[PDB]
Homo-oligomer: 127 residues x 4
């Protein structure tokens, strides 16, 4: 098949990650990596109570740097923010040792499709 | 555009209809008209506490007959079940006087797409 | 942890099951077991082109698809319809061997939360603020 | 009654707005106003092909898209970015005249429930049984 990620599921995953980052008072802010980190970043911010989310784009103590998935950009993040808490929603075998924390494990060979790249449209019957 | 109906929204509509049919003890059962009435029927049954949903297919006192939308089949239902409480989730101007109750009003010219006929798939960017 | 099942995901499972039930030309009808099997039965009917779904509260069975949401007794269903193709969406271990086909394997101790018993509502922030 | 907004519907609105913002070749970037505007900004960036979304907690503006979720003060945004194209998803009456473009009209007294503040959870049957 194909690893489909719906909004509801992404939200559930993000909420689990949020609870794992408590207490919220220990964080100064959240840095989301465009574009995949934007939505998960906004969710964490809403769950933790952080009013503002900063954004970056690749080619910091107390800050959380978030990205949707880590397959291989992790390096650039580590160089720019050495003291940041790098977290991701999904993680493959290769990138697993790069993030400080993640939520769901997906096989290296899985084609994962994110909710922002999909939509609800008419799907013809199989018959 | 096109009138898109998602699962969550259909469920909300059904729940509103369910609350309008209280008390639940006054109903003997629920008759769903295949196929559009199946899902809404199962939802009502779950909300009212009716363990079994009967099904019919067109070419009853205490029973609720449900269909997804009434555009023009309403007649056949009235003949087969003269004492049934005919209800629908959606209703257009033409069929509005035929049902005993409904939830949402949609223009006669609106192309309504139901959740069971759709799905979450990849949608190319507009750019 | 409970196995949350959203409408979208259930539909994916149902469609996948429909694919296995092809071609549709062989099936004479669908018998959805109330009350959970009704929704997946409706989805199957749609995907297979079957215009009518019959329901039973519990005709030899040949050509009919008997569907229920989960399995873990099916013995009664098999007794009522011996020659029917009994299928389900989810299935636990002990119940796995009794169905003709299913889609997702669920651990015996896992509590499945079906879409129809849930709803989209306000959820307070974990931090309370 | 509150205006419930689900992820699916929000996305539909966002895409519709994106269509009006075409072609994309004219925009130099997107400035999402925290914290609600960030999600729609991400969707716009995706639809328009804009690789980076900037955020502001509140460069003349020419070529940039300043987006927020709802409007009903925008006066500060207009002051910070005079030559920017201020857009939103929803908009109330009093706030309608201040935005350059929006998608859905919301009555002034309507309480909008955004997707990010909601979640899919168990909902007890109305009949209690």
């Amino acid at each position: 098949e194909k690893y489909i990620v719906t909004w509801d599921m992404l939200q559930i995953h993000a909420r689990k990650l949020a609870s794992r980052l408590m207490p919220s008072e220990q964080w100064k802010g959240i840095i989301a990596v465009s574009r995949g980190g934007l939505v998960p970043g906004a969710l964490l911010a809403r769950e933790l109570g952080i009013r503002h989310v900063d954004t970056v784009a690749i080619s910091g103590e107390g800050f959380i740097v978030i990205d949707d998935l880590v397959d291989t950009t992790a390096v650039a993040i580590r160089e720019m923010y050495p003291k940041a808490h790098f977290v991701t929603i999904f993680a493959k075998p290769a990138g697993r040792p790069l993030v400080d924390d993640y939520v769901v494990d997906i096989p290296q060979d899985t084609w994962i499709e994110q909710p922002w790249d999909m939509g609800v449209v008419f799907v013809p019957p199989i018959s």
